[PDB]
């Protein structure tokens, strides 16, 4: 059974095993079972923690259901792959990646009033190619007033740093005026419409280039793994893999009664059904219930 | 798909584009005489304008039956696609067995013949491992777990550097 | 044995989801 905070997180989820746990829960609620009162407890740090481990149970089967567009030509397999991960973000409780990483910035730097500390604990989330090209401009402006540039905005010592960091943001390719004029906004709905259509022209060219950089690293890893494997003799390969397969079974067999280990060996039995159902009719495929 | 769909028998396809299947619709104002012809078979029914609108009421929602997962099968299809590019260059290997006769054995230097018999034993090493396609499904499981951990990001599954740098420009070049 | 289902055949197999569930069932009752 599910602990009723999982089943609230699997309602908008769309993978198979989360929906069959929802559907057998909704079948219990048709037979008059009482919906348990969800907890108005678990203060802010615990609520952020169990949300992190409930989103990762919607993300983890969902990532395995998204076909990578490896070796494809064009932008639409990469835009499909990106859009399936957007919808996996929305199904798991994430907001937009712009709204999710900006919340990560302002949470990590809620204590900072100097820019050199803002550029130092937002280090894990920006490029080191971009963290360095802002630390060059920062340590020239701090070599200009010989005082630390403040995270104030109304300080003029920040204003000519932000005017030079805007010149860095174009030096990466980021439209710094377009991004700012979207997350600020405008009064009329017609002049904010023309800035959303050119933010989303950047944004779609942005998230495609992160998906396409993820595909080009899986393509390069798989071509590196294969060429290391094609240089082996066949007798080495079959016993390297049978050693790795058998070691990984006994890690699931020595695990006493754990839910992941029963589900591991239930899926080894379901792979062997797939190989057996294909052997019965190979031009048909596996047998589904129809 | 959404809940309500607004297509059917208006601006519809009137005819087929191939020759493998022959489509003929005859639209009146209310109904339509479709005539389909595929192979030897033929069928012709009457589709109402409010019979195609009930079609998108209960959705099909196709989904892939994979051996392991859709992710793994897309990595394994790429390794099968990469093994084909290596098999195509073992296709262009010169037929060394045309020089196995004893008029090449005895005319040749005894060390250039042992190199030739080693280069023929090497092709059978390369060819018997590029056609070991039952090993590609376990090479795909060496790519999956490191990819799947990058998708378990604490920010977003679809986050990357270009977006997170573009959202630092909004965060830094606004007031504090 | 044959002809399982469709909604049972749509499951991604060797996902984690149950290590993630296991370390959520021994962390949240331990940090509360």
């Amino acid at each position: 059974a599910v602990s009723k905070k999982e089943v609230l997180y699997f309602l908008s989820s769309k993978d198979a095993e989360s929906s069959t746990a929802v559907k057998s829960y909704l079948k219990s609620l048709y037979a008059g079972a009482q919906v348990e009162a969800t907890e108005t407890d678990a203060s802010e740090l615990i609520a952020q923690l169990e949300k992190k481990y409930l989103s990762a149970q919607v993300v983890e089967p969902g990532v395995h259901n998204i076909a990578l567009p490896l070796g494809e030509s064009g932008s639409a397999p990469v835009k499909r792959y990106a859009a399936e991960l957007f919808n996996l973000g929305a199904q798991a409780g994430f907001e937009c990646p712009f709204i999710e990483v900006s919340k990560k910035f302002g949470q990590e730097t809620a204590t900072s009033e100097t820019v050199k500390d803002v550029l130092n604990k937002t280090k894990s989330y920006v490029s080191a190619d971009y963290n360095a090209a802002l630390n060059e401009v920062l340590s020239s402006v701090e070599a200009e007033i010989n005082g630390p540039v403040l995270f104030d905005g109304k300080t003029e010592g920040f204003k000519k740093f932000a005017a030079k960091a805007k010149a860095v943001a174009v030096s990466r390719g980021l439209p710094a005026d377009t991004i700012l004029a979207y997350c600020a906004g405008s009064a009329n709905e017609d002049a904010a419409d023309k800035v959303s259509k050119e933010f989303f022209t950047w944004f779609e060219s942005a998230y495609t280039a992160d998906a396409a950089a993820e595909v080009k690293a899986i393509e390069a890893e798989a071509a590196s793994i294969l060429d290391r494997h094609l240089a082996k003799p066949v007798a080495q390969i079959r016993k390297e893999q049978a050693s790795a397969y058998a070691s990984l079974l006994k890690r699931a067999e020595t695990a006493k009664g754990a839910k992941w280990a029963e589900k591991y060996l239930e899926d080894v039995k379901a792979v062997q059904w797939f190989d057996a159902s294909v052997a019965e009719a190979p031009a048909s495929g596996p047998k589904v219930a129809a | 798909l959404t809940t309500f769909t607004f297509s059917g028998l208006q601006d519809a396809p009137v005819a087929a584009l191939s020759g493998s299947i022959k489509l003929n619709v005859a639209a009146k104002a209310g109904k339509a005489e479709v005539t389909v012809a595929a192979g030897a078979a033929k069928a012709a029914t009457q589709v109402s304008a409010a019979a195609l609108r009930k079609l998108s009421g209960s959705k099909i929602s196709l989904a892939e039956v994979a051996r392991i997962s859709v992710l793994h099968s897309s990595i394994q299809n790429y390794l099968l696609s990469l093994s084909n590019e290596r098999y195509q260059l073992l296709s262009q290997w010169p037929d060394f067995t045309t020089m196995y006769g004893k008029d090449f054995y005895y005319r040749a230097h005894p060390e250039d013949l042992k190199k030739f018999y080693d280069a023929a034993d090497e092709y059978y090493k390369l060819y018997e491992t590029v056609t070991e396609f039952d090993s590609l499904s376990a090479l795909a499981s060496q790519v999956v777990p490191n990819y799947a951990a990058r998708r378990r990001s604490t920010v977003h599954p679809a986050i990357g550097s270009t977006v997170a740098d573009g959202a630092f420009t909004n965060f830094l070049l606004s007031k504090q | 044995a044959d002809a399982k289902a469709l909604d049972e055949l749509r499951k991604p197999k060797f996902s984690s989801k149950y290590l993630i569930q296991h370390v959520s069932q021994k962390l949240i009752p331990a940090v509360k």
């Binding site: 894990s124 690293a217 060429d227 890690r251 899926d267 792979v271 | 777990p145 | 296991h22």
Partner: peptide, 30 residues
């Protein structure tokens, strides 16, 4: 065909580490 199960998160946001071109098309052409 089966993988080690992992339950850990990615806290950084990095580039995905493109590996190098292995020399096997150029070794098998030699």
């Amino acid at each position: 065909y089966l993988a080690p199960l992992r339950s850990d998160f990615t806290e950084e946001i990095t580039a995905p580490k493109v590996a190098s071109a292995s020399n096997l098309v150029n070794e098998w052409n030699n």
